[model samples]
Target: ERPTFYRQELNKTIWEVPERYQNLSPVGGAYGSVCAAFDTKTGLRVAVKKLSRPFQSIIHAKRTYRELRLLKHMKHENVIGLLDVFTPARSLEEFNDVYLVTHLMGADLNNQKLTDDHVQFLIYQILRGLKYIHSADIIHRDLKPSNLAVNEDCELKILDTRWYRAPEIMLNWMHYNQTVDIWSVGCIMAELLTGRTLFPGTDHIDQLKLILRLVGTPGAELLKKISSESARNYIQSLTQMPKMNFANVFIGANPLAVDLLEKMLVLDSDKRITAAQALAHAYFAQYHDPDDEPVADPYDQSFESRDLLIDEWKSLTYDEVISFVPP
Candidate 1:
């Protein structure tokens, strides 16, 4: 109802900070709120991620810093790049804000009736992008159809989402890896072939059961791998259902495509096929090229290892944010 640092009310979210960009609409699904905005200073359509109270705690501040470093460093064709970073404050003594700017690409891949060719090519593009990401040892916690963007040329860029979360994260497992994205790929592939969510569970617990219903209760050896003891016990208590027939569930899909999905849907995170391995699969043989699949140098996450105070983290992060020169 009243202006609080930001002007204009859209979707109950107040915007208009930097006093240059016009808020177009809400661009959902980030750790913070995002909106499509038009920049008057530069006359460009951009997406702005208003970072809220990132200094609420040491962890949150570090998260904000980590988020900035990761986005700024990553250079990928399929990955969204950071175009700009802005803040109203100039010094740490009066600092507490950031707005990440990225190209406002079109839209997500919400439930599409893509042909066999489109699906294959798109899947190839995903693995192609993923191969590069995994090389840097970064995990894409979210991967789903709705998070991906496609343009007129059918060019795709992944935006990331929650519906495609891996089972390990759902079970509160302490250790997770790139295979999490693999599981999402499995969910996404099935959704692509079926034109619906593969495991659309209502909540975390329901999502686990929904996954088990299709992939079936995992082996005791696999169950032993979960970091959460309660999760291990809970999984053991569930009805032991047999894995569904991929051919049957993915009706009209090629057996090779189903084979890849089967490997990715495994309960054991360690056992899931990697992006590189998936790219090399026979399913993608027609398109896979080792030369074309580039890799990124491992991301140095040493900052995350440090235990810095909130003020120190804020100032250090602000320095990087202000100094960043986006190309």
Candidate 2:
């Protein structure tokens, strides 16, 4: 008898599509192919991302490595998890595609207008997730509303990071810290309040300008911290912009919410509130949990700061796949 699906490495069949699982369809907004599938094995739904030819380019390889490395290691209720990972190739030469399995999310939070309470809980969860990520000395690098997944029950999980880079990242600052994620959370929170992207800059330069327009131009003290001389000079030569009126910007939002937004959106990265601090803000007093615990970080240095060949990537990914036994 033939199996519905086959794995070359295992020389056996796996992942059969059962009849009860309906609406197996593709999901958009990923660099690779993503499909939502019904899981008859455990009566659950799941998302499968196919990383095709991830090792073809340095950029693709790096992004693929980072995402897989982080997702496999970071576990939290508010962060996306790696339920499973696999490849069908029997050998290194035959391996080209990698698959990542995650719990299916109801929808991404992009363009969704959220109420004050909804925004509070959502941001709280984001901060909670970040607290775990930062405690391990890692910065999520990308944070935006679209990366946030939410269900009807208001449960939100952050996803699809790597695009919502911070201002320091835009300036090519080498030593940027977790405060970068804080800035992104600020942008996301503001978008939730106003139902629009707070800084929809056309380019990196324009992005900085958009941020400056709202946060006001930084002074020499902060400008000196910029790694790029051209960016620092460009900022210095520009007409200093005044801070936008928070009251007017976040109209109808709770004053404390606006205050928290202001703190997270500071022009100075040093001044940006930490995720732990943001979680303790007055805006989330109603939902604060002092006993909330943090997750531990798994240390794996195999994917750090070097380009790996296809065979190396295949080996590393396989190591991750087999590290934990599926229950």
Candidate 3:
């Protein structure tokens, strides 16, 4: 089905949420060019991701579906819940197509309000989600704050993103796999704590260079075996300059977390740490404070509960959205 149909349908469907709290208006771009809707129903608020130009490849499409399937199978306080999925093509046209729907999460760890201890707690929640996913042999190819959600309860949930995309695939355009995702989890930890992109490089060459800068260049013995010699040589050339030190950025941080973060940002994918192993880290173990735990279940509250953060509308329901929309 054409995207226009689904966009309108989703806009219609989301109007079912509570009019006082759900902000139906588009917030920001999510993963692809897709826009999102803020919804509130009953007393609870949720987020909806509306997509167009669905993943073209069957494998990629299946991967997206698999994420939804996997998320539906697992349930944890820290993992984002899969409330719904839709194929606007099926509903709008004779063909079958689908879009994902999940709860709208509140402030992410990337928010400025977190304290050092709060960051530590957030990491533990993330690790918990990873542990659950890894045990099922599921890997979150993309791990970052944008992919995470925190509700009013201050609860953390992993919004498994597209980190599974392999650099090889980007170069050769082949199917990607799980290893790339492990690299992403590490990247997420770095970004979450530092509140910035660790490798904010300009382009392909710069991206690799940024990686080298953070973790140092890979040794010749290591470079010789990498499938992409051109890519490897390109990376080697960039290493001529000294690598950047993230250690200073984490100054005064718990040495344990710093060490873990450093290992996570390793230049080589092979050397980067895994989510399962990360769960075992002492740093996570050190931060267990019962009083600090955020509640997991959904809640119902009046619009005043989230007054200042969102401004667009009272809810996603048709009446509510239409009320504010210029007639």
Candidate 4:
């Protein structure tokens, strides 16, 4: 594609532009296309999103609008704020060239030097953000590592709202709700504990199997409403699926964090924990002491610093993790 004065593709649709009007580099992981730029004019980075053409349907359009609407109504440090919107130049002859623009945020959680207490604090912040979104009746369906952003100050911002948009409305695929975000939160926490993707799979089927192996299977009545019969059959195949427990996976993980993870990743979305309920969990409660000294995190040190946790952790097997919980 030829370069637009305003946008140039760095890799596929991700754009990179020199520091100018809205000068910023686009950000994304393995999920979806994310177009971004940093604005020298406003001294802020911004994200411009358009649903992938294949995924574009009436449902996806509503989600884009719904996310815009939710951001307009909610405000917090941990939630991604919608700063503005742009309608790219379009010709009267065609209907393409559409997108939504919002704030550009920070890096992924794992990229930074994070300690146990810091992880606890981050989760607290995320729960607070999710609670606020739930209070406003918004549900985030996709809450993964990439969707959560960490600023230089170490504050978190819930960047992606596509997961919160109702799958029924956007994907025409499922009856998921707020619990979807909780499940994602659990997955992310597990990733943090394991230092890898919790259920890294080559495709969706493998991912589903990974989730089922860890969280057990969703029941029949619940599967019926899924728009895809194949998805339903895949879920149905997990009869007598072992109740995969985070406690076992994060064996040495802080006990409270394990409890919090279990409650969030429930197969029954109805029984799945809510953000408010997560705050009430013993796991979170353990970290609430206002005067507790912060745990020293050596992750920020340059590799030359030779930190034991940093060096030893790299060679440690999943089973050798003595300090954190199961898995």
Instruction: Identify the leading candidate in terms of lDDT.
Output: 1
In angstroms, give how far residue 145 of model 2 lies from its true place: 1.7
lDDT (Cα atoms) of all candidates against the true structure: 0.79, 0.74, 0.53, 0.57
The reply for model 1, stretches above 4 Å from the true place, is 1-35, 38-44, 54-60, 88-96, 160-163, 223-236
Ranking by lDDT: 1, 2, 4, 3
lDDT tens digits, residue span 129-207, model 1: 7888788888788787677887779788766435688877875576688788888888888888778888778887788
Model 4, residue 90: distance off in Å is: 17
Which residue runs does candidate 4 get wrong by more than 4 Å?
1-67, 85-102, 110-114, 161-175, 217-239, 286-327
Which 10 successive residues of model 4 have the least lDDT summed?
318-327
- For model 2, residues 113-162, the per-residue Cα lDDT tens digits are 68998888888988888888788777778777677898878787878533
lDDT of 4 by residue, 1-327 (tens): 222445556446743233343634456555346667666657766775654541255444333434444455556656776554333333323333334456665586644224667777788778778877776666666676677888887788787523222223333444567667777777676666656666665554465566667766666666755667776776575565867666778867787777777777666667778877777677766555433322211221132333344223222211111122211
| Highest-scoring model, TM-score | 2
How many Å off is the CA of 280 in candidate 4? Answer: 2.2
User: Using alpha carbons, what is the TM-score of model 4?
Assistant: 0.59
lDDT of 3 by residue, 116-146 (tens): 5776777777766766666555656656667
Q: RMSD to native for every prediction?
A: 4.9, 4.6, 12.3, 16.9
